[PDB]
Design an enzyme around this catalytic site. Structure first.
Site, PDB file in Angstrom:
ATOM      1  N   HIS A 124       0.977  -1.154   0.190  1.00  0.00           N
ATOM      2  CA  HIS A 124      -0.222   0.364   0.002  1.00  0.00           C
ATOM      3  C   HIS A 124       1.111   1.775  -0.679  1.00  0.00           C
ATOM      4  O   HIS A 124       0.501   2.510  -0.063  1.00  0.00           O
ATOM      5  CB  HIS A 124      -0.742  -0.026   0.762  1.00  0.00           C
ATOM      6  N   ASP A 145       0.426  -7.548   2.614  1.00  0.00           N
ATOM      7  CA  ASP A 145       0.559  -6.037   2.046  1.00  0.00           C
ATOM      8  C   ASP A 145       2.385  -6.370   1.440  1.00  0.00           C
ATOM      9  O   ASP A 145       3.339  -6.223   2.466  1.00  0.00           O
ATOM     10  CB  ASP A 145      -0.116  -5.295   2.817  1.00  0.00           C
ATOM     11  N   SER A 177       5.404   2.586   7.742  1.00  0.00           N
ATOM     12  CA  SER A 177       5.161   1.215   7.024  1.00  0.00           C
ATOM     13  C   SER A 177       6.534   1.138   6.212  1.00  0.00           C
ATOM     14  O   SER A 177       7.625   1.918   5.459  1.00  0.00           O
ATOM     15  CB  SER A 177       4.186   2.363   5.629  1.00  0.00           C
TER      16      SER A 177
END
Lengths: 252, 28, 10
Positions: free
Chosen positions: A43, A99, A198
């Site tokens: 993402h 992910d 992230s």
């Protein structure tokens, strides 16, 4: 990182900062797994909900960094993206299952005291290290609290959580491709990943061979370090079969 | 075959400020 | 906020 400490120099030589060309800025964190490949969450590169679909010709990768904002001449290294690979069954429409994504560097990057590759686990190593109770490490230049920023890379150690406990801390659907970590409400302890971490690496060092293994990718959370809530990561090993697929095929 | 081995710690035969905590979570 | 990085790197 919420409730961490400053990364000691060279402490995480595999941490890679995902940088945006224009405007210049920090997109995410990632990990170095060889002079030609870097691993990150999917993402960070693609997320329709926010109209995100970056192209290799949109960002760079800063390796061997420590200072979040400064250009670290003669230490860090900026490489260009050759090609980008996102897992084909990456479900962004729902729970970000799978992910994960791989980055192929235009050209190899010289290792050093500040740049070094992290090991990926094996079925066996994953088997004995991935267990509730054990602590892992998470690093990044992400936010310090929900809603300033770190001047230097942050470090935090967190204990892995049992499947049930993770499952019951959310309404979101948990899949086997993910696991969660974080201190329990009553273990009376705080710490978590946050905005900007992230793609970040979640690691552990095998007490057997003394090497560090990346067990997960900082994937998603519901706030940062909220009581009752846990942080979720991409179960690396369970997807290593795919990683190996793209790597050995598209050059290594 | 050199991975997970940091130049400033393992190779240098040194440990960081908190790797202890980790190694201690295994033992219990 | 982020310090400029080298022309070459663009």
């Amino acid at each position: 990182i919420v409730e961490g400490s400053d990364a000691e120099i060279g402490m995480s030589p595999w941490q890679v900062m995902l940088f945006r060309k224009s405007p210049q800025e920090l997109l995410c964190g990632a990990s170095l797994i060889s002079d030609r490949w870097v691993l990150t969450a999917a993402h960070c590169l693609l997320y329709p909900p926010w109209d995100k679909n970056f192209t290799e010709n949109d960002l760079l990768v800063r390796i061997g960094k420590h200072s979040r904002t400064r250009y670290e001449r003669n230490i860090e290294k900026i490489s260009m993206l050759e090609k980008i690979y996102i897992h084909p069954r990456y479900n962004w429409r729902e729970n970000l299952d799978r992910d994960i994504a791989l980055m192929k560097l235009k050209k190899p990057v010289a290792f050093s005291d500040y740049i070094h590759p992290v090991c990926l686990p094996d079925r066996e190593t994953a088997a004995s290290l991935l267990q509730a109770g054990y602590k892992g490490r998470v690093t990044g230049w992400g936010n310090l609290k929900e809603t300033g920023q770190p001047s230097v890379l942050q470090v935090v150690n967190l204990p892995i959580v049992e499947r049930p406990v993770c499952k019951d801390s959310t309404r979101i659907r948990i899949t086997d491709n993910m696991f969660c970590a974080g201190y329990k409400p009553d273990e009376g302890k705080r710490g978590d990943a946050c905005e900007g971490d992230s793609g970040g690496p979640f690691v552990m060092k095998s007490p057997f061979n003394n090497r560090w293994y990346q067990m997960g990718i900082v994937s998603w959370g519901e706030g940062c370090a909220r009581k009752g809530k846990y942080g979720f990561y991409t179960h690396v090993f369970r997807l290593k079969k795919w990683i190996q697929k793209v790597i050995d095929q598209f050059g290594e | 075959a050199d991975c997970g081995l940091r130049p400033l710690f393992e190779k240098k035969s040194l440990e960081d400020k908190t790797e202890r905590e980790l190694l201690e979570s295994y033992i219990d | 906020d982020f310090e400029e990085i080298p022309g070459e790197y663009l």
